[PDB]
Amino acid sequence: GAMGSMERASLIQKAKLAEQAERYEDMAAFMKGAVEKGEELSCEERNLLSVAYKNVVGGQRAAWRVLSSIEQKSNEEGSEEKGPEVREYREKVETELQGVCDTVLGLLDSHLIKEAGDAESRVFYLKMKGDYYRYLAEVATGDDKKRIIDSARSAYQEAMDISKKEMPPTNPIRLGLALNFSVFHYEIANSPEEAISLAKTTFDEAMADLHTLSEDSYKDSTLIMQLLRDNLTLWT
C-alpha cells in the first residue's frame, strides 16, 4: 500500500492535519495506512478512522441521492429520453461508494474486530460494520440485497448485545449505536415501530442514568440523546 513506508505515528499526525484542512479523502487514506500497520487502535485513533470514512461516504451518499432523484424523474411519464448518461453517472458514483464501503468493511474484518476485546472497542467496530453494510443496502437492488440487509442487522445486533451487558445506558457509544440501529430499522428494514421503540427506550434509560455523570459526561450523553429526540420528532 502507498502508506506502507510511512511511520504509524506520522500517519496519525497527518490524519489530524487532514481533518483540520477538511481533506477527508486524505484523512481516510492516512487512517487506512495506520490500521494496516497491524496494531490495535486507541480510542482517539478509532475516532479518526470513523470521522474520515463518515465524511467521505457521506459526500458520496449525498451525490448518489441527487443523481438517483434525477434518474427517477427521467423515468416518469412525459419525461424526454436523454440517453444513458444519468444512469451511467449514478452507477459511477455508486461503484465508488461501494468501493469505500468494501474498504472499510475489509479493515474491520482484517483484523480490527477480531483483535477488539474490550467492550468499547468491539462495540464501536461492530457499529461501523453495521453502518457500512447499511450504506451498501441503501444502493442495493439485486440478488444479494436481503443478505446485505441481514449483514447490517447482525453486526448491529451483536454490538447491541455487548453494549447492554457491558456499558451504562448513557455511554456515548451505546447511545450512538442505538441511534444508528434505530435508523436502520426505519429506513432499511421497513420497521418504523421497532425504530421508534428503540429510540424511545434508549432515550428513557439514558435519562434515568444521567444523575451518575460528571458535567462533561452529561454534555456528551445529552448531545446524542437530543439526536434520538430529533428522530422521534421526525417520525411521530
Partner: peptide, 5 residues
C-alpha cells in the same frame, strides 16, 4: 434524513 453518528 434522520440523524446518525
Amino acid at each position: 434524513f434522520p440523524a446518525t453518528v
